Amino acid sequence: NFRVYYRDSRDPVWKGPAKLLWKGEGAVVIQDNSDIKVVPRRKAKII
Amino acid sequence: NFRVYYRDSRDPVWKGPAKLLWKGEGAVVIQDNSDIKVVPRRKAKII
Amino acid sequence: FLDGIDKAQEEHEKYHSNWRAMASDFNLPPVVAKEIVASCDKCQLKGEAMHGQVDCSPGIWQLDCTHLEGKVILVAVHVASGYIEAEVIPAETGQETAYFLLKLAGRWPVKTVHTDNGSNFTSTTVKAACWWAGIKQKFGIPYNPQSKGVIESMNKELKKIIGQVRDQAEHLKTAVQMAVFIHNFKRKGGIGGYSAGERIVDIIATDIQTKELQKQITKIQNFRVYYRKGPAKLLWKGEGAVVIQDNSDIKVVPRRKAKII
Amino acid sequence: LDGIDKAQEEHEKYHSNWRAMASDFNLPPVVAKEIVASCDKCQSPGIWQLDCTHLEGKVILVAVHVASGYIEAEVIPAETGQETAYFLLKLAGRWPVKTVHTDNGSNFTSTTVKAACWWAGIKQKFGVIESMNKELKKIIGQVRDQAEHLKTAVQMAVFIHNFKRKGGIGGYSAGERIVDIIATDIQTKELQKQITKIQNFRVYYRWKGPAKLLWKGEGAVVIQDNSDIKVVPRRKAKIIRD
Amino acid sequence: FLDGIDKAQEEHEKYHSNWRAMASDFNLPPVVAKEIVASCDKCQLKGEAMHGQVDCSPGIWQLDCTHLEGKVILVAVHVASGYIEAEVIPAETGQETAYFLLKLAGRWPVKTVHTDNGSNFTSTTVKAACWWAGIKQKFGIPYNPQSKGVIESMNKELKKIIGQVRDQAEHLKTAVQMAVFIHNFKRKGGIGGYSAGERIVDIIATDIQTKELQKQITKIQNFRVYYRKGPAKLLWKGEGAVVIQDNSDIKVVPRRKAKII
Amino acid sequence: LDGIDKAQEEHEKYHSNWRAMASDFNLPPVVAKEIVASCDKCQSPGIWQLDCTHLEGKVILVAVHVASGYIEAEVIPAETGQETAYFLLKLAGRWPVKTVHTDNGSNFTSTTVKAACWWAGIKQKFGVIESMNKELKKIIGQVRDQAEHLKTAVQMAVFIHNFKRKGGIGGYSAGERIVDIIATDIQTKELQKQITKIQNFRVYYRWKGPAKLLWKGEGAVVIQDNSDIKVVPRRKAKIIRD
Amino acid sequence: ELQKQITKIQNFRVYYRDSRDPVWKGPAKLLWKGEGAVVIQDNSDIKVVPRRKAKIIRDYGKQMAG
Amino acid sequence: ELQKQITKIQNFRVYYRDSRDPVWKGPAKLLWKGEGAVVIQDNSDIKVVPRRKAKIIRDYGKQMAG
DNA sequence: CGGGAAAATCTCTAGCA
DNA sequence: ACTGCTAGAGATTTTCCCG
DNA sequence: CGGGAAAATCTCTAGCA
DNA sequence: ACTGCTAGAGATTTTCCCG
Ligand SMILES: C[C@@H]1CCO[C@H]2Cn3cc(C(=O)NCc4ccc(F)cc4F)c(=O)c(O)c3C(=O)N12
Ligand SMILES: C[C@@H]1CCO[C@H]2Cn3cc(C(=O)NCc4ccc(F)cc4F)c(=O)c(O)c3C(=O)N12
Ligand SMILES: [Mg+2]
Ligand SMILES: [Mg+2]
Ligand SMILES: [Mg+2]
Ligand SMILES: [Mg+2]
Ligand SMILES: [Zn+2]
Ligand SMILES: [Zn+2]
């Protein structure tokens, strides 16, 4: 599996780790504490 | 001679034409109605 | 360096050293230093250094609102051509957005709309209007104007032309319509040296024409190809290459090891 | 190139147009247009028709692209020159509008409508609009119950007419037809541009007299001398501007 | 096209058409279309698409103030190395800026300072302090933070490290000093895989050493060179090339057509 | 490479250090350091000295880099551990501070100063500082009239001492000297890194027994066998990790 | 009959992009068109392109210049 | 005497930029240094560089790895 | 000389507000 | 007469290690 | 085949707020 | 499961025009 770290939409603080649920060209889908979220790959890091 | 057109520091409206007084790498020195001004070449156009 | 990793760990627990500092100092391999930095949550602070690519299928429009002199200008762009349609509306409300979209879809073929999450767009009215006229609503990632870069740049350009012409009109709505005319027919460039109006006409006519031609080809050209595997429909062949579609998976294979029946 | 004589024979047998030659025997469009223009015996997309309609005590402004029957309509607050002018300015910024045909009225014969027409480069001229207003009203009645305010029913009828009704030769919508007509018109204007570009030159070949330049390619130069199109190699010809 | 230019002029007086639209439509040469656009004041709306380059001589520092949790952090960077010095001050005043600069110039060799035009920097106090310690004050173009890009990026980086360490300290000033330590000694990269502390030491020692070596060479190596022209001091020679300095104008000439005396 | 024997003879004649060999006969520093380390008969930059001084009813914190005499000073509100710790944390983030030598006092022997020393990796130890405080006070008196508040005169005296006074061997400032000393120290730590890297390998050449790897180049491998440095071609040698 | 269709499809110009390159790649040459993928010819190199990334035109213009 | 000085100047590495390129150009080789211009050797190509654009170091770690 | 692996170099982004 | 930069994250291209 | 001139292509920026 | 873009301004590199 992968850990995801991500800037949320407006908040400047980086959150994570979250699970990777889906990876596209341009965006990812992550799960952080039962909270599905869609983040730009610009605002996210997958390990 | 050259005409200069330039965004001033903060105002979004483009002014000009002004005379070229000096041209450097990165900035120009212009005269617009007896008002010497130093503009970035990013914010200016010389014709 | 088995001993240094422990020292590099306790140190990073304090200074959070990049991988190079720890590799230099505690004499660790680059992979081990990178592994130490990689497991610290307090150092995962930067995203990927790329950009996505927005969709450009001939049926997708990007809509946004924008503000100029106290008024709300509602703007659409056809993504593939750059063709804009704008209008000074009196309020960023769902009623004025659903009416604008109903007019757009009655003029041009609109399949998908891409907007941000402003309320006028996430309305039940805009939704029932899109439903009535078979339009699919895409919402970008919240607070990601990059997902709508086309319409955002067109906001920039529309407002630049509006500034150029504003003195030729009394009211803002007239300036706005003149700027739409000017962007659509008086500015040439892009892929075919086109104006946005000509370019959209080309994109729509080409779409119609090629869909027709292909319906005809596939009605006539009926073949099954075996390559390397099972049967596969033949798409196009030529110049020592035979593009086929097997199990909804298009692939190009060389002419050898490929028999047509 | 080699089939120019065949194209010339074709035109003398069926009087077909330049597009047919260009699609069949593979010729540049200027050369086909020249072949079709050499026989004297062988000798719209921008006109809109405007009119107002009244419905349930409100006025609908209707513009019909005559060549296609494509319709653009909206409800307007009042039959004024301001509203007719704003309508016209919207229409011309969205479709190439060259000429508007209106009835003798006030809104249409107004200095503000005239000023909008002048700013947009539109010429004015004072039974299509009537029949297509009838069809508009029919659709507006067919869908009235699906919308509270009248303007929504007017735009729903515009949608249905432009895209859900189908007829004619091969069953196309008004949107399909206007797109094809405007596309043909862009082709036409482009070929006119190419002619207007090349007709300002003269060619000298093998020297012989002056000869009109038609096409200019990689290893050939198609010209015209004494009403007879002829191909010469580029190295053996000289092109000047006059 | 002499006739079209008049039509292209009246049209541009209305729509302001880019050069491509007018060239396409009125059949004008590209140079003539560009000349029409070029003489309309209402179309000169975009600057040059480049960036300048900030000075990086070993004696120039960039100073800025920045804000974090209600406090004012005064920051300096040595441009050539990336070496930072910061301090939570109680007020963006000239007194607290002149005292900070007096301390910097007593620790490191400071020749020029580059700041924006905020009041703390354009003070008479900062000016008399810079005068006392022979420092030259450069002020960038007003509202051009690009001229101070180095210190601005260092603001970004300082605040990132401060966020990483903030929980290890009670007060902000302690977090700030720890972040200065961390940036100066616990982050390696750049030109010589250095930390900013090592890099500044190298830049200063190299400057001292090479100035000395050259004083010695020029005291020993005394020659006049004639090339192509008059006499010219010889700077360095080798590998079929002889760099000379004539009339305060350095030039490299090939070994041929150049005689040393 | 060829002059390794000459360097060996040189060390047996004048007992010069590895830097001399590396600068003279052009040898990698690890090989020169090995040559200088093979003779038993031939066998600071991070120490600071802290102390407080009192002047006109205010306390000055003074830190002197002993190897150079470079001084860092400021006025502090009070002789507390908080202020000594904040001073120390500033000093270590700006100069590489390994060891601080203080007198037996309160501020210096405090859990907060101890915590700052521990966070920054500084060792503590409880007539240089006295003389250089005297010189500091002399300059502070020389410039007092040029500044109203005492802290400005303290920083002006710091400036003058670190950069306007000159003495010693060739007349350098304390800033010049500390920069050279820290630069030598970075060189030293780098050579120590290179040794600590290479000494984890063994070499087999021509096979013979194990041999310590010294330098590894493009077309040569300098090793050491039986206390005798020897050069072998790379193709004829094999390097492993142990 | 059919070859006319193939060559006419062939006259249509395809601008397109790849996964990470923001620059649009010069007019290729349309070989086949489907509901979601386009098959083109870019400098004697056959590529398949997602529909969502390909703008297809005729270049009325290049065409009337031949 | 003098050649030692020349080669020692020669050991110093020069990073530098040109007029419109934001990228720093890899270590050249210091040939001469003046109050405002630096003369370097960048891949057997002698250039003169404004001082304000050149960062000059030794690379203490390259030097001690020889 | 040649793959595989490692390292160096290149490309590109956010934030500095 | 003055001027975007920095440091990390993936991608690409050199460099190296031994058969 | 070869310079010179023109055109096409490349590189890069602000604003969208 | 989604995604920066656009149009102009200088710079650079192809393409062309005729000796
Ligand atoms: C309340 C709705 C919904 C939720 O969010 C807000 C706020 N917002 C902010 C911007 C904006 O920041 N544009 C600057 C920009 C920056 C980068 C880039 F690539 C493109 C760009 F346009 C918009 O454009 C926009 O339409 C909105 C909006 O509509 N809303
Ligand atoms: C009152 C003083 C003097 C006059 O102007 C103001 C306002 N200002 C604004 C920014 C700012 O907008 N930073 C964002 C940014 C954008 C682009 C870029 F390349 C670098 C960047 F930092 C500053 O950083 C800053 O120090 C000030 C300041 O000090 N002042
Ligand atoms: Mg919006
Ligand atoms: Mg927006
Ligand atoms: Mg500031
Ligand atoms: Mg700032
Ligand atoms: Zn960490
Ligand atoms: Zn204009």
Residue numbers in the entry:
A (entry chain D), B (entry chain J): 222 to 268
C (entry chain A), E (entry chain G): 1 to 228, 236 to 268
D (entry chain B), F (entry chain H): 2 to 44, 57 to 139, 149 to 228, 235 to 270
G (entry chain C), H (entry chain I): 212 to 277
What is written in the article reporting this PDB entry?
HIV-1 and other retroviruses integrate a DNA copy of their viral RNA genome into the genome of the host cell, a process that is mediated by the virally encoded enzyme integrase (IN). Each step of DNA integration, up to formation of the integration intermediate, occurs within a series of stable nucleoprotein complexes (intasomes), involving a multimer of IN and a pair of viral DNA ends. Because integration is an essential step in viral replication, intasomes are targeted by an important class of antiretroviral drugs, the IN strand transfer inhibitors (INSTIs). INSTIs work by chelating the two Mg2+ ions, blocking the active site and inhibiting the strand transfer activity of IN.
We next analyzed the structures of the double mutants E138K/G140A, E138K/Q148K, and G140A/Q148K. By itself, this mutation has a minimal effect on integration, but when other changes are present, E138K consistently restores integration activity (e.g., compare Q148K with E138K/Q148K or G140A/Q148K with E138K/G140A/Q148K). Furthermore, the 138K mutation interacts more strongly with the Q148K variant than the Q148H or Q148R variants at position 148, suggesting that E138K plays a stronger role in the E138K/G140A/Q148K pathway than in the E138K/G140S/Q148H pathway. To gain further insight into this interaction and probe the role of G140A in the mechanism of drug resistance, we performed free energy perturbation (FEP) simulations focusing on the effect of the G140A mutation (E138K/Q148K ➔ E138K/G140A/Q148K) on the potency of the INSTI DTG using an all-atom molecular dynamics (MD) free energy model. In the simulations, we observe that, when the residue at 140 is Gly (i.e., E138K/Q148K), the positively charged amino head group of Lys148 fluctuates between ~7.6 and ~8.5 Å from the two Mg2+ ions. The accessory mutations E138K or G140A largely (but not completely) restore the WT configuration of the protein backbone at residues 139 to 141 and the rotameric configuration of the side chain of H114. However, they do so in distinct ways: The mutation E138K, through its interaction with vDNA, pulls the peptide “back into position,” leading to the reconfiguration of both the backbone and the H114 side chain.
